[PDB]
Amino acid sequence: GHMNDALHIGLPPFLVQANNEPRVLAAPEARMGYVLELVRANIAADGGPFAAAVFERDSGLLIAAGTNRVVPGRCSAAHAEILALSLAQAKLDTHDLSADGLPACELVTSAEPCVMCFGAVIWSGVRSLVCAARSDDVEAIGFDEGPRPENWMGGLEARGITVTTGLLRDAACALLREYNAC
Amino acid sequence: MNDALHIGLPPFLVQANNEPRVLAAPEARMGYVLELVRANIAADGGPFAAAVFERDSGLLIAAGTNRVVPGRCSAAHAEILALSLAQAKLDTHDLSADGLPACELVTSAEPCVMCFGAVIWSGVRSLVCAARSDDVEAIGFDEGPRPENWMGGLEARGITVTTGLLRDAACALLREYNACNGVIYNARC
Ligand code: NA
Ligand SMILES: [Zn+2]
Ligand SMILES: [Zn+2]
């Protein structure tokens, strides 16, 4: 919340637990399935229907997790991706997840990123982005991706950030439709 | 911290955020923002600062600076800190919430693609920049892939855009940062 000497975004209990419990999820769908559990927990904790987590790309070690905390956190920048990337950087002691000596990091996200989070992914040093719900799915429940540049996926790829989309899309869409209805 | 994202502010930036201040003219607002750039460079930060003001009264709401490298946080651009600190102070994620004064972000340089999106989501209704994108790309910063006519994109959303305000002073500070950012000791820095 508001502090004179910091920007401070608190985490709800499920998300503190996510960021402190040891967890290694080797398979891509295992990583996304866990991210989807975080989506449902986040909704129960008064946040938006979006979650993300940074994993070591090869082992599947969970480094950090984030969810949308925009309304309860009074912070429009508190998208899942921003929280996950920033909490991973804090844990690993560097702004640059591609720094020498760090293993390759991947951001596994419940939905394709908005233009803000597209920029955050570029600056973060992650080497891979894996998304479930597509941009059109997000827009079709009333969330705005904003004016991304033309060929934003190619923009990531040109910078050495691989992009995969549609992973457990149907499961992510079940949670999004449930949210929208409620 | 195990239970929060926590971006500490250096003492000068705490001082900036604590003291009531009213700056009416655009040049007055930007002059203050550029003071924060110089203080930030002296505190190991990047040569960037920004502040949210009440657009029509000049009251300072919050200030932010680039704390990316010392704060170990690639999202800790000046604009993200200023907008987020203003939201925390005003107790809302939306700086255009009903009842709030129209807010303006005054920033030392044109925003990168991340901060461009943050400006859209923030609720500010005016963006005022000093250094141009080409100025910052010339000292090795990257603005990243913004959409074509990003300025027009802001304007269409009812966010006015002004750029080049006190550009010469902002350029002088960028060149200063560039001359002092290396490893060989230079006592003049
Ligand atoms: Na791909
Ligand atoms: Zn986003
Ligand atoms: Zn930026």
Side-chain angles (χ1 to χ4, degrees), chain A residues 157 162-165:
Chain A
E157 292 172 336
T162 65
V163 177
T164 152
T165 60

Side-chain angles (χ1 to χ4, degrees), chain A residues 152-161:
Chain A
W152 66 268
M153 294 181 193
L156 292 181
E157 292 172 336
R159 281 177 190 261
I161 305 154

